[PDB]
Ligand binder design. Structure first.
Ligand SMILES: [Ca+2]
Ligand SMILES: [Ca+2]
Ligand SMILES: [Ca+2]
Ligand SMILES: [Ca+2]
Ligand SMILES: [Ca+2]
Lengths: 164, 164, 181, 164, 181
């Protein structure tokens, strides 16, 4: 048919959290997972109309001095409209992880296996499988550079060219 | 999987219509059927993101003297965005009933079986299967204590804590 | 193929719409609230000419059709007054829209007329014309409406009566068009 | 695997030949068929490294009055390095067509089915299946608006983002 | 029939030429005359890149075709010197046109290489690429030529040697065109 199964890895966000401001509940990476964020999927969505996320797995890859004594929590809220940035909301979601700033982690969430829309629109629940939230649980002694890699396996369909 | 199946009866609305304030077309209960209204299902959906109604059967218990004069009509619009609160909408829809103020009737409605969302959004078309309306046909004589009990049976999924 | 001066038109499917819809349903043609003591013998509670405009969901469907034929027509008087009220009502269907006589005898003559007390419901199964009737209005209304429902008070009423006249229509529209108000 | 199959029609070139400027042998469209020219396939190949043409069928739509005087000849050299832009090359190759300025013809060419590259290189012999030429046979009378639409069907591989 | 504004073109047989010719033959790719005493070890007697231009009768045929595939290639070294001359020759076919190494070991490594004395003839049955190669030149010559024949003096020659390198090519041209110099 018209379906194409693409996959790859991408860096949705990279943030330099300064030393001393790593207070609990402070959002570090609060990103909405739309095809725009992923570069290869960004190019591939412009030539299609409806996609479905078959597999989505994030990786937190902090790069900090070992003297850093803080921690992070990572989660994937499957509701793009959600504006809650509390620890309990993250931890309740499937696949949420808690770790120290010197340990990379993997988040395996529960994405909705439905046919979404590549393009943007008025309602975000039809255009984004969810949104990733990372909170700095503990105060960090040193500046921490955090990178949130993503591994996606979408199924594009309904061929059509579009514009940003 | 995560196909939590729940069922049970719950009072969506308790209304006290005063005597002599039953002008025809007066709306007694105008409730958008979201999981938050149902007590047990409210707690259930506070820890889930998606639900899908599998069996919905409202039943009306008015506690009134058998000699009271008046009547009630009940219906369930399968479109939450509809704001029409007249007898025409109720008589048009399927499963609507009309009865005397002392009778108990079951409003077996036509609802959607897709996967809706347990939280608010821009449109209610993905958050609630419809809207229940109860209108006071004729002028009541005594005081009316009506209670609408909802026999619901939904299936939840996508575990995630939520805050109202 | 050659290049002609002007090529032939290629509109094939023009004026080939559907000419048969068996629309049916139930609707309230009249709602009345009689104050106590005003139900004098002969008072006209309901005087409704059965036209497609009167029926709400049938009006829009008849707007896009020329002729309709009533296949099944039934009325159901449903008073909502208590069982302690005194008086009677009579309900009937005059098959002549131009008739303006409003008396108990006139209704009683017609087939299917019902006489009852106000605390009891009745169904008026009438005699209507099966022929095709035009949807739109005209000089003579006898080509547009099967008849007129009339509901009278047989006797003086004691309490306040809230009657409701329901109709179960079943038409078969044809001759497609886009009739306009 | 990574055998993304795509297909569709796309206008490689829109040309406006002025009236009275149709000297015989004038080249209207001289396009090397790289994926960049095709709009949808351009976006597709910006996120891939190798493609392999599986079905290539150009079709010419000139919008001209039926009474115009002149003609067009079209061909597809399967060698991108060829710089000959004369009628001899077109009449030699397979699938070439000649017609009046108001007629639509399909240039069914002889192309290579190997795996080419989506980016530039020292030689075009591994980056494009060939070169399309459209020549103005005879002198045009009116103004000519020619559009060449390419029915393409390629298979991409080796995912990698590229910048033009 | 009617008279159209402009009649349709009637060119039917356009761009339908033959795309398969199995041209074959034999030709001399190099003729050398070595003066006595100059056949020092390692001297390059023959260094010939096998291209359609080099083969005389194949050049014109490849001028009217795009891609050719070598189906059978064989070389025959035929010295014409007497039997009283001392020294040896080595002949081989490097399958890489860009290779410029000219040593005895390089030829000896390849399959089909021959080493002989000057008063004796040998046939070089080489290993060539069966794939389709473009007739015309380009940026990379590895898509245009199967390889390069190299003939060296193994040892110092005593008399004057007149060697002659013959090639038995057998190609299969395709993808018709009118390629130009
Ligand atoms: Ca779109
Ligand atoms: Ca939510
Ligand atoms: Ca009419
Ligand atoms: Ca590249
Ligand atoms: Ca060439």
């Amino acid at each position: 048919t018209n379906d194409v199964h693409l996959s790859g890895m991408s860096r949705i966000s990279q943030a330099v959290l300064p030393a001393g401001t790593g207070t609990d509940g402070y959002v570090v990476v609060d990103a909405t997972i739309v095809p725009d964020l992923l570069p290869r999927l960004g190019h591939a969505a412009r030539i299609f109309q409806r996609y479905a996320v078959e597999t989505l797995e994030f990786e937190i890859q902090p790069m900090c001095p070992a003297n850093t004594g803080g921690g992070y929590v990572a989660g994937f809220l499957p509701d793009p409209t959600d504006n809650d940035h509390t620890f309990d909301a993250l931890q309740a979601t499937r696949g949420a992880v808690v770790a120290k700033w010197w340990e990379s982690r993997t988040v395996r969430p529960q994405y909705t296996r439905t046919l979404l829309w590549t393009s943007s629109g008025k309602e975000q629940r039809l255009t984004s499988p969810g949104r990733l939230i990372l909170l700095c649980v503990g105060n960090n002694t040193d500046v921490v550079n955090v990178s949130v890699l993503c591994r996606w396996s979408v199924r594009l369909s309904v061929p059509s060219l579009e514009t940003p």
